[PDB]
Symmetry: C3
Subunit: 341 residues, 3 copies
């Protein structure tokens, strides 16, 4: 008659996240600036379901999750389905960690996103950049991913392979594989990652991409913390063209009582095609944030950032290649709340 | 081990609503009548999640809600995302009421919908009418809305501002602001509202709209209740054209034991453009309903209505302006159930 | 303060289902084979809500359900809305069974799907076939369905009528009706069903379809179980053309301890148009499966199947008629898990 934790085979969880963001664009076209700029709300709130089950006849515990998408992001319409964010089944056991099948972050993307896309560094460092093909996937369906245990309390590995975007619709044979490693050393964590994408169809060619990342995170007792990463992207097209572009991201934090101050910087350097530097193909971003720990489950923040994007380039089909800079440079001021349950 | 109300940081709620609706169209084209008319089911059922949190370091209580859309409405395909209906975050405190950010009803729209679009008066009084620009938003994303407390147990105010439909996609600079007030006087409630829409792009112009509303609702001890509203819509286009149209809606109810009888009527009067009446631009609807209070949480109803729409007009670009009458006049018989938990 | 079953007016339920499926196509075009074939994950996981209410003033119990769609199927993108699968309201009472309004399986479709489309026989026997018009609906909105009680513990009937696919959007006047009956006697069940579709618009004509089904299922105590069905499809177009096609499906199972071995076969025979057999319009599939009962609430399985589809035909507008064979023959190896809560 009376319920316990065991009465249910699932848990609802949520991230309630609302940002009010004012953008000021300087694209060169005043109408486009009026259109893209101004105040919006960016509602990144999402609901998920998850659970576990010890099957009677198999030792590794079954796990599963189904996570909804952002319910009303800026620049988009209302509503999200279930299964748009990390959504998987899997198994776990103490001695070998976990394996997940479904829709998860790639090992490389996970590091690109956290720590290195925060606060607002993502237009440059996440999906920014000018390279052809596919530098990496991000959250990707049709994936198998292994997460190792924390060996000797210090070292862990994440490895995955998956189908590409066209392959997932029965429209291509693209695929990828990736791996990351993490090592904890006193106040530091060292990070390294790789992703290779193959059979990528774009601009009339087939591409292979290889992306490499090295990074550090540190947390010191006097309240200073930081991160830094360097990311190296290479791409080869089936007509013989080679491209390379590198990038970096860094952040510095000072935490005192219920406050975190943060500065962030990220940059993509000029792209190189067949040994030649394409001028003005770099991007950068500077960001400042103050965050208040309003509760153990929530934060309030204020943020200011300035994005200075590349001036454009063509792809290998002689048409403009789309980048995060195609819509122009902008600055943004924002405030927000996030709450976790 | 045993659960309480406090074990969860969310509540699921729902409105389970099904209507079987038979429409008989008289559009002037027999094939169109056959297509638009006939029996459908209108499943307006929806699920929502909501909760609150007292943040340790902030006095006003945090509130949130994520509401799904109608799961299978008539004239539409199956399935709704989370966040299609009222979906927001906010804060509340006894002395100042509540503030919500996200997707909510405008102050004007809320009164236009309830009481004045029920039962089935909405084709005329909600989204019906012939005026250019945007007479008002309805449920709108990118909104901040304040709801005052009930001052002196009599008077309350709802005020809001938000981004327009194009601005929410980064495709324009439309916006709007609105306010409503409610005053209790014996068995009556008096209502007034305003909305102003700006930078609305349509028919090759930019438009400003101003809409005003005044109303009454009454509930008497002998079982009679009623509502009546008058609504005045004005619009100015950037080429100098002015338009005006007004409207009304009224309803009379008799409640006895577990039954409510209801008659409803709404009309849009002829539109005026630059001081000249456009003939046959009016609409009206008459509706009758019997409702049974089948449970404290539910109702059953039967409803009959007749819609007589305008005979068409052009917009300022010399093409037909779409209205709720464009698909033709129709009558409708329906039965339904609604249940709340 | 403490919660019971009665504290909630709804239950969450789910089917967590993941299949890893490798397809090898032989379409005649090596690029198309590369595109459609390869490994995908087919995530058929879904979440639902359901509940009941005894209304104070009505004896038949109110029932409802809202079921989400597959969260990330193969050949499709991520995310599903609530209300994509069986989503309805209804009433139930011991003496007359249940009545549902909304989105449910048709009586014919329910038998076509289970037992007769498992394991992987659906390309041929569910949506396969070459006949014009609409052989039957499957899961359909705008439906009323009655499920009788089990009379004398042996005999039951399911009957339904509904609006068609165009009618549901206000774009046509299609409709259907169907019925099925089941008789249980010792270790056998006999099945029979019918569906008639009317006013179906396709290929420049209006169609009527009539589809008939007879079947048997058996379950014996020595671990042998089986099913077999015969399905007869007839269609008449408004220009006088008659089409007929028949089909079958059968399966044999052997269950011992926690294992089920299964073989399945289904076929569509050559279609006949105006008394003439259209050569090479048949399809068939053979499938083998081993299933392990890993828990009382879950299964693991491995499956191999070979599909051999028709070589194409034209519809009555002299263009290719789409069938489940249009993309070419393929074989498939898969493994999966399903778990129910
Ligand atoms: C980007 C890297 C940021 C590094 C932040 C500083 C980390 C720690 O600095 C404080 C050093 O702690 C040792 C204290 O040294 C002073 C000791 O003086 C003598 C008293 O015993
Ligand atoms: C302690 C680490 C210090 C690292 C300093 C290296 C900074 C590199 O800055 C230049 C990279 O290019 C980014 C600037 O791009 C701006 C956009 O350019 C407009 C036309 O491309
Ligand atoms: C200022 C508030 O006044 C409310 C007056 O109510 C008028 C209702 O008119 C309805 C006409 O159909
Ligand atoms: C308060 C509602 C009473 C409405 C009855 C008016 C009937 C007028 O018929 C108009 C025909 O259309
Ligand atoms: C508080 C009592 C409210 C009394 C409501 C009376 C409403 C009168 O009916 C108006 C509907 O008129 C329908 C057709 O008339 C068209 C004339 O156009 C100009 C409007 O004055
Ligand atoms: C002259 O009348 C011809 C009919 O015109 C169509 C108008 O629609 C009905 C409007 O009812 C409200 C009138 O104010
Ligand atoms: C369409 C033809 C498929 C026929 C397969 C029938 C095989 C079933 O074997 C039954 C023999 O049973 C011997 C053992 O009986 C144990 C008690 O069973 C009670 C009835 O299930
Ligand atoms: Na804008
Ligand atoms: Na939005
Ligand atoms: Na991708
Ligand atoms: Na119709
Ligand atoms: Na519908
Ligand atoms: Na709007
Ligand atoms: Na493929
Ligand atoms: Na998929
Ligand atoms: Na259908």
């Amino acid at each position: 008659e009376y319920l316990t934790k065991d009465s249910f085979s699932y848990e609802v969880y949520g991230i309630i996240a609302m940002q009010a963001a004012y953008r000021d664009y300087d694209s060169g076209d005043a109408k486009q600036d009026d259109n893209l700029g101004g105040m919006q709300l960016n509602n990144e709130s999402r609901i998920g379901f998850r659970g576990k089950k010890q099957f009677a006849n198999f030792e590794p515990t079954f796990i599963w999750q189904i996570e909804g998408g952002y319910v009303d992001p800026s620049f988009g319409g209302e509503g999200a389905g279930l299964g748009e964010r990390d959504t998987f089944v899997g198994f776990e056991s103490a001695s070998w960690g976990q394996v997940r099948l479904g829709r998860v972050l790639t090992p490389m993307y996970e590091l690109v996103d956290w720590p290195a896309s925060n606060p607002g560094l993502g237009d440059v460092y996440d999906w920014g950049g000018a390279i052809g093909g596919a530098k990496y996937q991000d959250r990707q369906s049709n994936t198998i991913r292994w997460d190792s245990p924390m060996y000797a309390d210090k070292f862990s590995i994440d490895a995955a392979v998956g189908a590409g975007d066209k392959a997932g619709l029965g429209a291509g044979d693209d695929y990828w594989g990736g791996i990351a490693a993490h090592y904890k050393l006193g106040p530091l964590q060292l990070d390294a990652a790789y992703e290779g994408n193959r059979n990528i169809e774009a601009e009339g060619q087939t591409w292979e991409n290889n992306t490499y990342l090295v990074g550090v995170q540190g947390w010191f007792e006097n309240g200073i913390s930081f991160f830094a990463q360097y990311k190296y992207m290479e791409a080869d097209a089936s007509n013989g063209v080679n491209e390379k572009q590198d990038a970096m991201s860094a952040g510095l934090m000072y935490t005192t009582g219920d406050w975190q101050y943060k500065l962030g910087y990220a940059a993509n350097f000029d792209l190189e095609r067949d040994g030649k530097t394409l001028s003005n193909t770099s991007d950068d971003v500077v960001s400042a944030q103050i965050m208040y720990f309003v509760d153990p489950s929530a934060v309030l923040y204020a943020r200011a950032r300035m994005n200075d994007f590349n001036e454009g380039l063509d792809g290998l089909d002689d048409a403009a290649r789309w980048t995060s800079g195609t819509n122009g440079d902008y600055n943004e001021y924002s405030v927000g709340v996030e709450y976790y349950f």
